[PDB]
Design a protein around this ligand. Structure first.
Ligand SMILES: *[C@@H]1O[C@H](CO)[C@@H](O[C@@H]2O[C@H](CO)[C@@H](O)[C@H](O)[C@H]2NC(C)=O)[C@H](O)[C@H]1NC(C)=O
Ligand SMILES: *[C@@H]1O[C@H](CO)[C@@H](O[C@@H]2O[C@H](CO)[C@@H](O)[C@H](O)[C@H]2NC(C)=O)[C@H](O)[C@H]1NC(C)=O
Ligand SMILES: *[C@@H]1O[C@H](CO)[C@@H](O)[C@H](O)[C@H]1NC(C)=O
Ligand SMILES: *[C@@H]1O[C@H](CO)[C@@H](O)[C@H](O)[C@H]1NC(C)=O
Ligand SMILES: *[C@@H]1O[C@H](CO)[C@@H](O)[C@H](O)[C@H]1NC(C)=O
Ligand SMILES: *[C@@H]1O[C@H](CO)[C@@H](O)[C@H](O)[C@H]1NC(C)=O
Ligand SMILES: *[C@@H]1O[C@H](CO)[C@@H](O)[C@H](O)[C@H]1NC(C)=O
Ligand SMILES: *[C@@H]1O[C@H](CO)[C@@H](O)[C@H](O)[C@H]1NC(C)=O
Ligand SMILES: *[C@@H]1O[C@H](CO)[C@@H](O)[C@H](O)[C@H]1NC(C)=O
Lengths: 99, 361, 252, 120, 50, 49
């Protein structure tokens, strides 16, 4: 558990990708989660409704994923700015700042 | 790039413009090698049907089924299908088919539907709300009517509780509609449960005998037996093809797989819940469905003040599926590769950068 | 032909631990190197499984409920257990299911059998007395033979949507008396489109004749409940471990 | 690949363009972060072949010539200890170039102290 | 009607969790600043102006 | 306590799990913030009487 911070970031990104892929398995109230099954089973007047339900569910999932990606990007940017400050002040010079 | 950025002047850099995906070439349909036709004739062209309280169910499996024979023939007044399109039924495969045949009156033809009420729906024949199939009703005046009354077709009129979906009730017990026990004798407040239609050919179109056949298709996870009349094509591998394997439709590259399927398993699936392996219906061969090459197109350019020359990067796409240079970032077209190292001007990725001096990478 | 067996010894049936047995493949889909959560009719871990004996004078053929589903375990040597009876009233009024495994093949028949009070088979050291009649038969299926205690037979019988799912696993063991502690996922054996109501079931045994003698065998009956399992699929697609989601807080 | 689905998706406007723009901004921000952290020197410093540092041993932090990855033993241990329309863009700086940047920083801080960070 | 109530309450809860995450990021930045002041002003004498 | 409402809520999937996980992350982040700010010493010192 020495390297927990990097493994935490990798696990969070992998879990977000797995959740986004997993959200395709949900039908969001439609008859099926597979677009090809709906297109091969139904006429376009009702397949339009089923595809619309799938589109709004997947779009909400994708917007949610982008929202947490932006929040994690802000957190990683703050950590990277801290790392750049430590590289400038601790490696390239001797720092009088305590701890 | 100018259209994407909504500007007539493009600054120096890399810009994501569109996405590239290789089109499918062929279409490969693989169905099991069966030839025998299952008796739709014995279901539809039977001499005598059954009453609706004792509706006749026939199990249909292991056949080629031509549904457009039933569709295009001008003999059925109602061919109304729920959960599936009637024209598309030739292009689908189902595990089992239930054919439920009975005889009702014309006004009761509407009652054969999910979420409907009446005497037939409550007491005689109930359809589940997740019903997938077709209801096929046609007039039968010459067969099921007789001058003086045809009383051999009975419907259940009295029951304590409504029927469950696909429940068959053939019991004949005297319905107790009051407090007095009936003891098997009809009389005051004690009725027989079965009531005769009493068909005559002079009756109205509402009181007219209609023969109804309900086809219900089991689309559950099982080996598929009933399949349409679509002809199987030969298997082509290592290319991007549309495929229809036993009614399972997709687009991908079919290759050899080292996955040892257990003999009861047809499909394969991964942690991403995607069908990445299937069993061939004919050769019993397990095929890995690798999805086809795709990525983003990036237009590497200097400023339009400097030059109008551009290069294109296909991200994560090998150069043989699209001044050609293969990078880890993708295939780069239009930029010459040099062995000299300079500072990064336009970043490509994976240690690769581009500059203008022609466009070099 | 029916024969009353009047030389039985009265004894209550026993109970023992299920351990981590009774896990079957929930579907026909290949999965590899994955952890899959499924909610289905499963046998709970460490449950109270009923134990019946055949030893000489014990001959356990009682009337048992079927409920949602039945897990059937058999510590068997020398092939005494031959088949099962399923139905509701076990007479000609209703329609009943017969599964037998004689010396040649496995026969499944769905008929209105007028069953005997004590249905049994016999081996002479050529005897079959199970039903007296069979009038209306809808389904027939002839297949291959499925089969110190040396052999362990696990079966799972389920009846959903008119489909009878039989899951089977054959295990070489060398444990004398009880269920071995371990894990073995039951592969599906057969899916039968019987479409009949089942609430009661019977075990079919075989007598040994020169009265009668019962060979040494033991079987276990457990009942399935709807619950969630977390199954682990290895690189070869074989279920190697399972977690009962509602057993204890650690597994939860 | 459904054309009808994309036609219905076009009714919602430029949501997909917005999401792609946000992801592109994040992707270039990661490369900017790596440039800000590791690319603080424009000279690639190298250690002398003779490791005479007055008794100080830096073999565990200097790159190993015997390894093909040109990583330090500590960096090699660190790399060993860390384990449908989605694409992964490669980083602009690869692992060997980041290791080369760290090696240059190590050579600068060993051979020159803090003088290389303020000038020659 | 229950579906309308469910989607309205779910949208409200997602909005609440999103703004809570934004406030958590702000409080985390303030707490990192406070930890820096604890290390540099209390545990030592700082040459940094203001 | 409405079971029909929960049955309809199950159609939307694992939204509730995501909200609980985000709130759990915020809750442990607050304790981490207090730990970083105040617990900078492992010796509990006292002034002389
Ligand atoms: C074996 O025993 C059972 C029960 O002890 C017998 O079943 C009974 O038979 C009598 C005589 O026909 C009937 O009056 C009873 O109604 C039966 N019991 C039940 C519960 O139905 C059975 O007949 C015996 N077998 C033989 C061959 O005699
Ligand atoms: C610096 O440290 C390294 C590692 O501790 C020393 O390398 C060891 O040298 C001894 C004797 O030559 C060997 O037995 C070990 O196997 C070496 N270990 C490794 C990991 O290489 C090295 O001698 C030290 N001194 C110098 C000047 O480099
Ligand atoms: C029933 O018989 C008629 C004979 O004219 C035939 O045209 C029709 O196709 C038959 N129906 C079926 C389902 O075979
Ligand atoms: C028919 O399919 C079977 C698989 O069940 C296969 O073994 C056989 O070779 C096939 N025959 C032909 C002529 O394709
Ligand atoms: C099993 O049930 C019997 C009675 O039904 C009981 O005496 C026994 O203690 C139970 N065993 C376990 C392990 O629960
Ligand atoms: C099945 O049988 C039991 C008892 O034999 C009965 O209570 C139940 O209603 C039956 N179910 C059906 C669907 O016939
Ligand atoms: C086993 O049973 C089947 C059908 O019941 C029969 O045809 C066969 O002869 C039987 N074999 C023996 C050895 O009794
Ligand atoms: C079942 O068998 C009895 C007697 O053999 C017969 O009277 C009855 O009609 C049969 N039922 C069916 C549905 O064939
Ligand atoms: C999987 O199968 C291979 C044989 O190809 C075998 O070597 C390996 O041990 C198996 N894995 C497990 C976990 O049994």
């Amino acid at each position: 558990s020495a390297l927990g911070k990097l493994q935490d970031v990798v696990n969070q990104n992998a879990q977000a990708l797995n959740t986004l892929v997993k959200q395709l398995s949900s039908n969001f109230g439609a008859i099926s989660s597979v677009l090809n099954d709906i297109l091969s089973r139904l006429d376009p007047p009702e397949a339009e409704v089923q595809i619309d339900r799938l589109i709004t569910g997947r779009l909400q999932s994708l917007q949610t994923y982008v929202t947490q990606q932006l929040i994690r990007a802000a957190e990683i940017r703050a950590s990277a700015n801290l790392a750049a400050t430590k590289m400038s002040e601790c490696v390239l010079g001797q720092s009088k700042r305590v701890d | 790039t100018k259209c994407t950025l909504k500007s007539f002047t493009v600054e120096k850099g890399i810009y994501q413009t569109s996405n590239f995906r290789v089109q499918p070439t062929e279409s490969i349909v693989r169905f099991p090698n069966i030839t025998n036709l299952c008796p739709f004739g014995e279901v539809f062209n039977a001499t005598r049907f059954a009453s609706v309280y004792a509706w006749n169910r026939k199990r249909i499996s292991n056949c080629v089924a031509d549904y457009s024979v039933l569709y295009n023939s001008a003999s059925f007044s109602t061919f109304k299908c729920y959960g599936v399109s009637p024209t598309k039924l030739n292009d689908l495969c189902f595990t089992n088919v239930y054919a439920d045949s009975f005889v009702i009156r014309g006004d009761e033809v509407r009652q054969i539907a999910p979420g409907q009420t009446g005497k037939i729906a409550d007491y005689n024949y109930k359809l589940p709300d997740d019903f997938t199939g077709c209801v096929i009703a046609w007039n039968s005046n010459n067969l099921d009517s007789k001058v003086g009354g045809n009383y051999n077709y009975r419907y259940r009129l009295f029951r304590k509780s409504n029927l469950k979906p696909f429940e068959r009730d053939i019991s004949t017990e005297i319905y107790q509609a009051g407090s007095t026990p009936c003891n098997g004798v009809q009389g005051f407040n004690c009725y027989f449960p079965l009531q005769s239609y009493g068909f005559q050919p002079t009756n109205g179109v509402g009181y007219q005998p209609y023969r109804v056949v309900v086809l219900s298709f089991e689309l559950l996870h099982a080996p598929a037996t009933v399949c349409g009349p679509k002809k199987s094509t030969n298997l082509v591998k290592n290319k991007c093809v549309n495929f229809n394997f036993n009614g399972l439709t997709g687009t991908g590259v079919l290759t050899e797989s080292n996955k040892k399927f257990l003999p009861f398993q047809q499909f394969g699936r991964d942690i991403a819940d995607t069908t990445d392996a299937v069993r061939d219906p004919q050769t019993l061969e397990i095929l890995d469905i690798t999805p086809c090459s795709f990525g983003g197109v990036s237009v590497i350019t200097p400023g339009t003040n400097t030059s109008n020359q551009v290069a294109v990067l296909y991200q994560g796409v090998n150069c043989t599926e699209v001044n050609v240079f293969q990078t880890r970032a993708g295939c780069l077209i239009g930029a010459e590769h040099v062995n000299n190292s300079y500072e990064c001007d336009i970043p490509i990725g994976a240690g690769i950068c581009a500059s203008y001096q022609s466009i070099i990478a | 032909q029916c024969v009353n067996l009047t030389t039985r010894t009265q004894l209550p049936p026993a109970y023992t631990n299920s351990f981590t047995r009774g896990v079957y493949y929930p579907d026909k889909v290949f999965r590899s190197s994955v952890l899959h959560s499924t909610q289905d009719l499963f046998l709970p871990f460490f449950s109270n499984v009923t134990w019946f004996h055949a030893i000489h004078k014990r001959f356990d053929n009682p009337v048992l409920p079927f409920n949602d589903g039945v897990y059937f375990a058999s510590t068997e040597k020398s092939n005494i257990i031959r088949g099962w009876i399923f139905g509701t009233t076990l007479d000609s009024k209703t329609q009943s299911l017969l599964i037998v495994n004689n010396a040649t093949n496995v026969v499944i028949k769905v008929c209105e059998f007028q069953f005997c009070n004590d249905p049994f088979l016999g081996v002479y050291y050529s005897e079959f007395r199970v039903y007296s009649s069979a009038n209306n038969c809808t389904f027939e299926y002839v297949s291959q033979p499925f089969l110190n205690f040396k052999n362990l037979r696990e079966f799972v019988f389920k009846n959903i949507d008119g489909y009878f799912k039989i899951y089977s696993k054959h295990t070489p063991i060398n444990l004398v008396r009880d269920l071995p502690q371990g894990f073995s996922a039951l592969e599906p054996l057969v899916d039968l489109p019987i479409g009949i109501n089942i609430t009661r079931f019977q075990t079919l045994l075989a007598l040994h004749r020169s009265g009668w003698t019962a060979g040494a065998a033991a079987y276990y009956v457990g009942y399935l409940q709807p619950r969630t399992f977390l199954l682990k699929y290895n690189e070869n697609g074989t279920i190697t471990d399972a977690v009962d989601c509602a057993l204890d807080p650690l597994s939860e | 690949d459904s054309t009808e689905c994309s036609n219905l998706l076009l009714q919602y406007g430029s949501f997909c363009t917005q999401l792609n723009r946000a992801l592109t901004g994040i992707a270039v921000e990661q490369d900017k972060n790596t440039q800000e952290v590791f690319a603080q020197v424009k000279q690639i410093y190298k250690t002398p072949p003779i490791k005479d540092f007055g008794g100080f041993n830096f073999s565990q932090i200097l790159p190993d010539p015997s390894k093909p990855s040109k990583r330090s033993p500590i960096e090699d241990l660190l790399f060993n200890k860390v384990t449908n329309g989605l694409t992964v863009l490669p980083p602009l700086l690869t692992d060997e170039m980041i290791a080369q940047y760290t090696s240059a920083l190590l050579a600068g801080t060993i051979t020159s102290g803090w003088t290389f960070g303020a000038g020659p």
